[PDB]
Design a protein around this ligand. Structure first.
Ligand SMILES: [Mg+2]
Ligand SMILES: [Zn+2]
Ligand SMILES: [Zn+2]
Lengths: 1166, 468, 50
């Protein structure tokens, strides 16, 4: 079969230098004139920047002169003025060129930081410019006379050398010279010479530059680029419509800046041509050549020399490099981010009646959004004669169209989005419910995932047009299909505030209430007792209940008994489906327990029952909360009776310590700490006074004198249930609030003795202001900081996706409880949950396999491990996975919005970065910058040092600025001696043996060491445990998985040590390398396989290296990326996410993973 | 420091300003140089005979007097009789070549030197000479390379019998029998050399000069040309400072500084070309007008994004002038029609002229928020077609195509013919008559019923909804 | 185009040489007109209403 010669569907892309003839291929004519439009008839002047002959017809299918106006005539080139009549779209396509008199340097290859022309010729930059400006002569192909090949000469010297040697010596100046140098250059011969010299001399200064240059040369040879192409003969002109002159209102015109630039390049060029036929003196044509050089530079990339300014406007005109460039790099898919049809937006409201899978949609919005569907549906059933009549119908808003819209809305999900999108839950699919009014209604249970308050936040709607988008939205992005945070398996649909206050007030008990002590057959007549007003919602009562336990084999057992409970719990039991025990609702049902209810329900009955369950909880919560009549009055906040007295006693302490400072018994500094300390203790006292009083002071009577239970006071119920408020905020309401801090960071020794229930005076409020302003500032700044972190994170991971099924390695990390100094700052069950065992684990006895080799550990397995005393489990991690260019699902884990093991093809990198980034707002060394330091690997300020090698060590030489430490291994060779400055207090015992990786001093240690000395598993454990400390100290739950994938991307690269295939010190992919020595281990050389050393690269550094240049061209510096790629002729195969988004095809993951796979195998095949 | 403004000022500053005496020296040199080429042109027979053959075309109405001579030293009658003089001196000198000729060949030049040629004509002559010398060089290098390189003969002995002859067979056929080591080798290539000698000896027939003189003449010409350019260049290099001083006036007129001084430099080049020192006009103030002329004349043409004719530019300037005084003179500013009476023209043209005179605004002008929103981002495409429309076009085809299948095959054909429906162009009702063989009014009747059949609704309810 | 020409032929409508730029009330906003102003270039005849 024949491959093709026309439009099929391309794969990859290639980039390289452009030949003058290659540039001429694109050009459909030479622009010979600066003229744009005629100035009266606005038609394009022929042979000008805007030309119908060269580029294209002004109007669709019509000749310029007007001879052929008929749509039939198409391939006709008009005989008067040649214009092939074709759609005006081709004026946006066809390019052009300009033939330059003198050669010209391409600014991108001259001024790029590693100047390409400079290091290709092994010539300095300042010299090349000195030659380009005609400020000196340079030798070329010197022959055997007096002179170096690249030597630079002056006026007299060139003259003297010419009198001495007339011929067999040649020198030029200007652009023609550099082009002559590059053309004469034979790269192959230069390569050979450079290889020998590398071997001979050993110096870091020499061979660093040496190896860099040799790589460039051999790359450039294989590239196919010929050095001459760095000097421009022909200059392409951009199609006219991409820099349009289009008219405006009032008859004014507006045009792109490129024209002003392009115009210039023509004129000077043309002038130079004229100046050749006039035989001008050297001093002029040289100046003209320089001017042409300056003009071309300004066109390509402006700002690397003079920053030329546009006509009549100070602002420098934007050039082609600035069109690609920007913030950041390519706006074509940078923030922000292109406009999209079939969308809308508005303020959002509640709609508690909604099921969790739907949302209220404004009528008008749905009409304008589905307009084409409505048109198509109207004439399918025949309610509209034709599409026009259908338009007129919906534009008339005839009553009949509303029913057709209910049809097209029914099964057709819509996408909802909020402003700060962080994790994937920022967009969720809902079923449209037609709603009168202009406001969007959003299911309350989802308000947690969006972080959307109702204080006027707006949301955007998107219509999923194609069928695949409907099924993607329904089966992936649907609300009910993500009920669980991807960061941790806990439900993110957890009831928020009003609902949880309802259930708290529902299952609670007072001491004596209507119906106390009686007995009822079942919840049905329990509700009947309550609703009729006979029995109180909370009263201790025995009722017969039937609970269920599925503890049989896939089978629901039933058992009935008399449970001691309240009326509310009895009524609530009606909601709990089937196999859940009554024990879960028999408690007080706070916000914490009410979440684990939904969680257990999900981990037991599955998905579907949990959804309907969640809905019911919301509905019953709102209803019963409304019945409860909860409110907040001014008398709901009870101040301690002893407050003023505590203040007075605390006031005596300060006057006691003050008297000690007047008499000098205590120093000034000691005083400050002292006074501040007594006030702090006082705050705790008032806090723990009002807390006792507020919490238990309801003191009530059942048949006797008194008794006391937890208070039914409104504000306490709010804080206790978990709805809203906390001991800190409550403490500010009743007890005194804090000790504020003056701007410099000190804390004022006269705290705020009043609170919000009382008045704050002038001073207290003024002092409070700083805390407020720093809070708002800190949050608004930490918000921005958080976002930036997620950027770096998604940049360094991204393309990481689950690819293989099982890589099949026994390798993994040891998962133990965090066990910090006390008992269990976090258990083992949470660390190992949802992960897979590396190898079978023992009972205390053995030949008894509890968990068999690699098995997903679910709730039953974790409880079975807890029954037994097992303290340690080794677990497979994404960092040790043997699969190259991805992670095997067997090594990852189950975690998802669903409880099943991770699917094949889900993109884990994005969700990992998102899971880490979203909570970063709540963080505050210590804080979010501490996290950033960790992921960046940065060596600390005053680091420790670890023993390089095991064996007995001692101190050697003397004080030069380092007092050397000499290590003596038992069997092995001694020679390691490290230079340690001795003015840093040591730890390591001068007479003791230290294992490699021991403590030779104190202070933090660089993770580079821990990777190098202790090993990969050690450093990954260090990162995860340290970063998890920061988040968990703030109360953020993030599973260790995501952190582990970030770590794997950090160590992606390693530096070879030995040889036998590739170069010695090259940093290179451990995927590539390991796959290369595993391929080399057999066949090839018997084993020549080379040893490497795993490396630790910071996230921002490791993200720098990416095979695809289109991806790199996005977030990095565009110019450098494009040049550095363009010289080597690098061929981008796509294969990644970022690049495919730019080019606009299916992402090689998720739904698209099937396609790319099917395409990837078709490639490199027959 | 780059910034080409600097590398010019410092590059030109080396050339030392000319003394008032030095100018005349260079100008004297110029006179010598050109007159050398003029005399060298006067010494070419074909240059004369060509001029003769050209004037014979002028009197035959095959050309015009303006395309040949610019006048002599010191009218159709005067031209005719002067050319007769040239022709007269030509026809004597031609036959006297039988040694003594030189005295008359010298006089033929003198009359010919009175003719001031049109620059176009003169260039073609010199070109013909240099092209003729290329024609001579072709044969010179052929006969040389066919001996030295091919047949292995030294150049040392090759030039002995060449100089002075290089035509007859004295060198070719009489030097091969000399029995030198290079002698017997010349026979192999003889066939190829002697046949190529035709054009070599033919040049002396056409041009009427032996290969001897042919080198000398245009060599002297070459020297003069070189001297000319040498002196003229020299003058220009001295006067760059004047150009710099003049261009400093036109800075903000909308062209770059170096653009100005370069166009002005071109003016100075022309100034040297047309300068005659015998008139006593200082070279500074003579070049100033030309340089100043070049600057302004250049600024008018290329300095705008929309090129405007000169009178338009001057008109615009004239308006500014009035607006200046009248701004404060009137205390407000002249009304849009105020400057109109002051200006000559129809005076309503102020609006039109004032509009096209405006310079277009940069499409990258940032507007608002400082955000990447730029003026160009807000300009919608008006040449596109909305899909909600395109959809109705594709439907209307199916519509008219459906309703045209509801009629008789001839009504469908006749209506598809009378309009461009699925066919190239459309056909006049007379054309339709010729295609159907039943012609004129007959066909027209059918059309009515066709339109009539779609008019009264069964058909009509579907097609009526397209008009709004 | 051909079929538009047939359409006008059947319904006999003369397609105007002037296109309609008239200002019409934005979609959805509804109110009462409380005032009207007409500014005219000097020299163009003010219409009736003006
Ligand atoms: Mg808000
Ligand atoms: Zn034409
Ligand atoms: Zn794996």
């Amino acid at each position: 079969l024949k491959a093709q010669t026309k439009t099929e569907e391309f794969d990859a892309i290639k980039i390289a230098l452009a030949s003058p003839d290659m540039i001429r291929s694109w050009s459909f004519g030479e622009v010979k004139k600066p003229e744009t439009i005629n100035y009266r008839t606005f038609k394009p002047e022929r042979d000008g920047l805007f030309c119908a002959r060269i580029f294209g017809p002004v109007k669709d299918y019509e000749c310029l002169c007007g001879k052929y106006k008929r749509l039939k005539h198409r391939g006709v080139i008009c005989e008067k003025c040649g214009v092939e009549v074709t759609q005006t779209k081709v004026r946006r396509e066809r390019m052009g060129h300009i033939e330059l008199a003198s050669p010209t340097a391409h600014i991108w290859f001259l001024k790029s930081l590693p100047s390409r022309i400079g290091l290709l010729l092994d010539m300095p930059l300042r010299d090349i410019e000195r030659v380009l400006y005609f400020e000196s002569y340079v030798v070329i192909e010197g022959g055997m006379t007096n002179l170096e090949r690249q030597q630079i000469l002056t006026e007299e010297q060139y003259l003297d050398a010419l009198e001495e040697f007339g011929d067999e010596f040649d020198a030029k100046m200007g652009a023609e010279a550099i082009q002559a140098l590059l053309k004469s250059m034979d790269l192959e011969q230069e390569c050979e010479q450079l290889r020998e010299e590398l071997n001979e001399t050993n110096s870091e200064t020499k061979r660093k530059k040496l190896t860099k240059r040799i790589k460039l040369l051999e790359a450039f040879v294989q590239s196919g680029n010929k050095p001459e192409w760095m000097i421009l003969t022909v200059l392409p002109v951009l199609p006219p419509d991409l820099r349009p002159l289009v008219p405006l209102d009032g008859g004014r015109f507006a045009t792109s800046d490129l024209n002003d630039l392009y115009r210039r390049v023509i004129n000077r060029n043309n002038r130079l041509k004229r100046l050749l036929d006039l035989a001008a003196p050297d001093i002029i044509v040289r100046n003209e050549k320089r001017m042409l050089q300056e003009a071309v530079d300004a066109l390509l990339d402006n700002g690397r020399r003079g920053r030329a300014i546009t006509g009549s406007n100070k602002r420098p005109l934007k050039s082609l490099a600035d069109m690609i460039k920007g913030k950041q790099g390519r706006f074509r898919q940078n923030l922000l981010g292109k406009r999209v049809d079939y969308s809308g937006r508005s303020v959002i409201t509640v709609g508690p009646y909604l099921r969790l899978h739907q949302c209220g949609l404004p009528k008008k919005m749905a009409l304008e959004l589905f307009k084409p569907f409505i048109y198509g549906k109207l004439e399918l059933r025949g309610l509209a004669t034709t599409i026009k009549a259908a338009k007129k119908m919906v534009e008339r808003e005839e009553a009949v169209v509303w029913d057709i819209l209910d049809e097209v809305i029914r099964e057709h999900p819509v996408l909802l989005n909020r402003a700060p999108t962080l994790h994937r839950l920022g967009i969720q699919a809902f079923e449209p419910v037609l709603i009168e009014g202009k406001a969007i209604q959003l299911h309350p249970l989802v308000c947690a995932a969006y972080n959307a308050d109702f204080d006027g936040d707006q949301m955007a709607v998107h219509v999923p047009l194609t069928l695949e988008a409907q099924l993607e939205a329904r089966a992936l992005m649907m609300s009910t299909n993500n009920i669980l945070s991807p960061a941790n398996g806990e439900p993110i649909i957890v009831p928020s505030q009003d609902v949880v206050l309802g259930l708290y007030y529902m299952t609670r008990d007072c001491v004596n209430a209507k119906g106390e002590g009686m007995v009822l057959t079942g919840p049905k007549e329990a509700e009947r007792l309550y609703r009729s007003g006979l029995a109180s919602l909370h009263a201790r009562v025995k009722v017969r209940i039937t609970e269920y336990e599925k503890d049989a084999n896939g089978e629901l057992v039933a058992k009935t008994s008399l449970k001691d409970t309240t009326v509310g719990r009895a009524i609530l039991w009606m909601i709990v489906p089937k196999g859940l025990p009554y024990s879960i609702v028999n408690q007080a049902l706070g916000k914490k327990a009410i979440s684990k209810m939904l969680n257990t329900c999900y981990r037991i009955l599955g998905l579907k029952p949990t959804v309907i369950f969640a809905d019911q909880i919301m509905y019953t919560g709102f209803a019963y909360a409304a019945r409860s009549g909860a409110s907040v009055g001014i008398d709901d906040m009870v101040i301690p009776e002893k407050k003023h007295e505590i203040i007075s006693e605390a006031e005596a302490e300060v006057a006691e310590i003050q008297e000690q400072f007047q008499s000098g018994l205590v120093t000034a500094g000691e005083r400050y700490n002292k006074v501040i300390d007594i006030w702090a203790a006082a705050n705790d006292r008032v806090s723990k006074a009002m807390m006792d009083n507020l919490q238990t002071e309801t003191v009530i009577n059942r048949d006797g004198q008194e008794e006391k239970q937890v208070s039914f006071n409104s504000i306490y119920m709010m804080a206790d249930s978990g709805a809203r408020g906390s001991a800190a905020q409550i403490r500010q309401l009743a007890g005194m609030r804090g000790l504020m801090a003056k701007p410099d960071g000190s804390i004022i020794e006269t705290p705020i003795t009043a609170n919000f229930r009382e008045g704050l005076n002038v001073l207290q409020y003024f002092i409070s202001t700083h805390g407020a302003r720093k809070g708002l500032a800190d949050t608004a700044l930490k918000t921005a900081n958080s976002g930036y972190l997620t950027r770096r994170l998604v940049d360094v991971a991204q393309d990481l996706v689950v690819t293989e099924d099982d890589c099949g390695t026994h390798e993994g990390i040891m998962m133990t409880p965090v066990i910090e100094g006390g008992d269990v700052k976090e258990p083992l069950r949470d660390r190992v949950l949802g992960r897979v065992t590396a190898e079978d684990v023992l009972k205390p006895g053995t030949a008894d396999i509890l968990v068999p080799r690699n098995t997903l550990l679910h709730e039953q397995w974790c409880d079975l491990l807890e029954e037994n005393s097992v303290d340690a489990v080794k677990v497979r991690s994404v960092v040790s996975c043997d699969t190259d260019f991805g992670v095997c699902a067997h090594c990852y884990g189950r975690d998802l919005a669903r409880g099943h093991i991770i699917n094949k093809g889900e993109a884990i990198g994005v969700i990992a970065a998102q899971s880490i980034g979203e909570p970063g707002t709540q963080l505050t060394t210590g804080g979010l910058p501490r996290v950033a330091d960790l992921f960046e690997a940065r060596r600390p300020k005053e680091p420790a040092i670890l023993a390089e090698i095991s064996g007995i060590v001692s101190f050697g030489k003397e004080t030069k600025g380092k007092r050397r430490l000499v290590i003596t291994p038992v069997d092995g060779s001694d020679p390691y001696e490290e230079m340690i400055p001795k003015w840093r207090q040591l730890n390591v015992f001068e007479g003791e043996r230290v294992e490699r990786g021991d403590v030779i001093s104190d202070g933090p240690e660089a993770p580079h060491d821990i990777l190098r000395l202790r090993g990969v598993h050690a450093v990954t454990r260090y990162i995860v445990n340290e970063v998890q400390d920061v988040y968990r100290l703030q109360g953020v739950k993030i599973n260790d998985k995501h952190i582990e994938v970030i770590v794997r991307q950090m160590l992606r690269k390693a530096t070879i040590v030995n040889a036998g295939s590739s170069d010695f010190l090259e940093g290179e992919q451990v995927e590539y390398s390991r796959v290369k020595i595993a391929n080399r281990e057999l066949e090839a050389n018997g084993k020549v396989g080379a040893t490497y050393s795993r490396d630790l690269l910071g996230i921002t550094k490791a993200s720098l290296a990416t095979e695809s240049f289109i991806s790199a061209a996005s977030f990095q510096e565009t110019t450098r990326v494009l040049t550095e790629a363009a010289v080597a002729g690098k061929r981008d195969e796509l294969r990644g996410l970022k690049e495919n988004v730019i080019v606009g095809r299916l992402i090689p993951a998720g739904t698209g993973y099937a396609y790319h796979q099917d395409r990837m195998r078709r490639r490199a095949a027959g | 420091t780059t910034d080409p403004v600097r590398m010019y000022m410092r590059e030109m500053g080396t050339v030392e300003l000319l003394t008032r005496e030095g100018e005349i020296d260079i100008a004297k040199r110029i006179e010598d140089g050109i007159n050398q080429v003029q005399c060298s042109v006067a010494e070419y027979p074909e240059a004369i005979t060509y001029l003769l053959e050209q004037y014979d075309r002028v009197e035959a109405e095959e050309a015009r007097l303006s395309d040949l001579i610019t006048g002599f030293v010191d009218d159709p009658e005067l031209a005719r009789e002067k050319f007769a003089e040239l022709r007269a001196q030509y026809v004597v000198t031609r036959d006297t070549i039988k040694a003594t000729a030189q005295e008359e060949i010298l006089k033929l030049s003198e009359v010919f030197k009175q003719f001031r040629l049109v620059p176009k004509q003169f260039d073609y002559l010199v070109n013909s000479m240099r092209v003729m010398m290329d024609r001579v060089r072709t044969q010179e290098r052929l006969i040389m390379k066919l001996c030295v390189e091919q047949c292995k003969m030294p150049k040392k002995n090759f030039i002995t019998l060449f100089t002075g002859n290089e035509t007859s067979d004295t060198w070719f056929n009489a030097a091969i029998a000399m029995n030198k080591p290079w002698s017997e080798k010349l026979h192999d290539v003889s066939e190829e050399v002697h046949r190529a000698l035709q054009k070599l000896q033919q040049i002396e027939e056409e041009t009427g000069l032996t290969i001897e003189q042919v080198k000398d003449i245009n060599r002297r010409m070459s020297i003069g040309e070189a001297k000319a350019r040498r002196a003229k260049k020299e003058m220009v290099e001295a006067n760059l400072r004047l150009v710099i001083s003049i261009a400093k006036k036109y800075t903000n007129r909308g062209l770059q500084f170096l653009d100005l001084i370069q166009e002005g430099n071109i003016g100075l080049m022309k100034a040297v070309d047309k300068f005659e020192y015998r008139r006593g006009y200082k070279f500074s103030t003579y070049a100033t007008w030309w340089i100043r002329q070049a600057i302004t004349r250049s600024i008018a043409d290329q300095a705008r994004t929309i090129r405007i004719p000169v009178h338009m530019i001057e008109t615009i300037n004239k308006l500014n002038r009035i607006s200046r005084q009248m701004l404060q003179e009137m205390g407000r500013e002249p009304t849009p029609e105020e400057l109109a009476e002051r200006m000559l023209m129809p005076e309503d043209k102020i609006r039109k002229v004032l509009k096209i005179a405006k310079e277009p605004i940069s499409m990258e002008t940032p507007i608002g928020d400082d955000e990447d929103s730029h003026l160009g981002d807000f300009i919608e495409d008006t040449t596109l077609e909305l899909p909600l429309d395109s959809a109705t076009t594709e439907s209307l085809r199916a519509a008219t195509h459906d309703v045209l299948a509801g009629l008789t095959a001839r009504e469908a054909k006749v209506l598809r013919m009378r309009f461009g429906i699925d066919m190239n162009t459309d056909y006049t009702l007379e054309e339709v008559g010729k295609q159907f063989d039943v012609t004129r009014e007959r066909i027209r009747q059918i059309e009515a019923k066709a339109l009539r059949k779609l008019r009264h609704p069964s058909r009509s309810e579907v097609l009526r909804s397209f008009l709004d | 185009t051909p079929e538009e020409k047939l359409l006008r032929a059947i319904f006999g409508e003369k397609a105007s040489d002037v296109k309609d730029s008239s200002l019409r009330v934005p979609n959805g906003v509804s109110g009462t007109v409380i005032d009207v102003q007409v500014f005219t270039r000097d020299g163009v005849e003010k219409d009736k209403r003006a």
